[PDB]
């Protein structure tokens, strides 16, 4: 992608996350777990849906049509009819091909973006109590039980509480 | 039966923006194109699990 997160520094996807597009896996004293993140999953979904509807909306062509097939050779007028229709068809084919390409490149870049944003957000929350391992995982330098992990996932995590423990653990 | 779009091959559904069936049509009908398939990605890039 453009942000190099998905198929980026994030090694691979989790096929076992059936409840969302993005999420957290964690490891702590209690065990390990995997949970989806609704807010970003829905961000991406909403965008892609909006896009989809923009593409399939009111795209139908309605007006009276000339004769597009001919039994007997004629001359000028028919040569012209055919030419008009061929030109039309080529232009529309091109429009379609281009549309699909731009759209798809964008869809990929945008999803990449969402992943990366969720990541930067998490990090900013963790403040100085964690380090960025580089694979999309954070090392948390204090004991963090399940409640605390959830507190990070739901945005209420208060770093000042664990700051001393964490710093102490990082720098010695 | 009910179909808004009619071609000489018979009726086609107009849900999609484009159609490869016939350049001759009647009714609200997708724009006719030369391509028989164009896939629009509705999800992220797929990166299967290593193993």
């Amino acid at each position: 992608g453009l942000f190099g997160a998905i198929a980026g520094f994030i090694e691979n996807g989790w096929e076992g996350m059936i409840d969302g597009w993005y999420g957290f896996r964690h490891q702590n004293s209690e065990g390990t777990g995997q949970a989806a993140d609704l807010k970003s999953t829905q961000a991406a979904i909403d965008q892609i849906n909006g896009k989809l509807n923009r593409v399939i909306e009111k795209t139908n062509e309605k007006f009276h049509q000339i004769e597009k097939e001919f039994s007997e050779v004629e001359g000028r007028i028919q040569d012209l009819e055919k030419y008009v229709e061929d030109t039309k068809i080529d232009l529309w084919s091109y429009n379609a091909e281009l549309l699909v390409a731009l759209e798809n490149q964008h869809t990929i870049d945008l999803t990449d973006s969402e992943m990366n944003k969720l990541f930067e957000k998490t990090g900013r929350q963790l403040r100085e109590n964690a380090e960025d391992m580089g694979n999309g995982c954070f090392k948390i330098y204090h004991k963090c039980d399940n409640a605390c992990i959830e507190s990070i996932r739901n945005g209420t995590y208060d770093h000042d509480v664990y700051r001393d423990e964490a710093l102490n653990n990082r720098f010695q | 039966c009910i179909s808004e779009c009619i071609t000489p091959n018979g009726s086609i559904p107009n849900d999609k923006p484009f159609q490869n069936v016939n350049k001759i049509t009647y009714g609200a009908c997708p724009k006719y194109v030369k391509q028989n398939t164009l896939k629009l990605a509705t999800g992220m890039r797929n990166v299967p699990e290593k193993q």
Epitope: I18, G31, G33 | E49
Partner: antibody, heavy 122, light 109 residues
Framework: QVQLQQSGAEVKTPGASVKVSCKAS????????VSWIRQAPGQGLEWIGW????????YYAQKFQARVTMTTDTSTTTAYMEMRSLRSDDTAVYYC???????????????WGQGTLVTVSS | EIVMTQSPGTLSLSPGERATLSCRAS???????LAWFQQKPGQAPRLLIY???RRATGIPDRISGSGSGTDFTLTISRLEPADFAVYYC?????????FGQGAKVEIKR
């Protein structure tokens, strides 16, 4: 179509053993866990346990801690459940259901095998 | 261990009416990880709801979960002949995972 295919009905006498099989197909087998759940005739559901086909982790209900062991075989994409020292009240239908690859995950038992009836009688 | 309690154990309702099933938990269900399953006679359970409000894929808008902490509800807005069946709740919050026992919906006649 994400199918879990369970072995045939069993009939065992008290004191014996049983090993039940579940052949998964239609998904990447090592991306999930499998959880075993039994139901006695005209009764409710009781969770036996959970195993990760991913990291090999294991969680057993205290009750079956002793008599049960869960395994998986990745080459056959197959999960097994072995119960030892059978009593007659172990008579039930045993279901194998797909679960998250890690224990403390956020969804549950989304796909169910057809179940296999184990009858313990003398 | 956590004690799942469903009430009432049986509902008699007519197709088109709304069924409301209750699940209380002895203590707070961690994370609100609570699932509803449906079982018809002879078949295996189906996953209806997980995460307490979230529909498993392939499931109608008429079937919906609600509630939190200790108190949860499963609602069916318009009863169709395929909805008469037994329903179980389970809490996957902690080990051991535990189910309530058998709330059965049936046709009033």
């Amino acid at each position: 179509q994400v199918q879990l295919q369970q072995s045939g009905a069993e009939v065992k006498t008290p004191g014996a053993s049983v090993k039940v099989s579940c052949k998964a197909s239609g998904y990447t087998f090592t991306s999930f866990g499998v959880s075993w759940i039994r139901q006695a005739p005209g009764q409710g559901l009781e969770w036996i346990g959970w195993i990760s086909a991913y990291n090999g982790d294991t969680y057993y209900a205290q009750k079956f801690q002793a008599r049960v062991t869960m395994t998986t075989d990745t080459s056959t994409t197959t999960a097994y459940m072995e119960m030892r020292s059978l009593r007659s009240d172990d008579t039930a239908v045993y279901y194998c259901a797909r679960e998250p690859p890690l224990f403390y995950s956020s969804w549950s038992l989304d796909n169910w095998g057809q179940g296999t009836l184990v009858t313990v009688s003398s | 261990e956590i004690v799942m309690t469903q009430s009432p154990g049986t509902l008699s309702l007519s197709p088109g009416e709304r069924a409301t099933l209750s699940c209380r938990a002895s203590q707070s269900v961690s994370m609100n990880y609570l699932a509803w399953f449906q079982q018809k006679p002879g078949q295996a359970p189906r996953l209806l709801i997980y995460g307490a409000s979230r529909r498993a894929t392939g499931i109608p808008d008429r079937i919906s979960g609600s509630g939190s902490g200790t108190d949860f509800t499963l609602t069916i807005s318009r009863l169709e002949p395929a909805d008469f069946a037994v329903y179980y709740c389970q809490q996957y919050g902690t080990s051991p995972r535990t189910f309530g026992q058998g709330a059965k919906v049936e046709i009033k006649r």
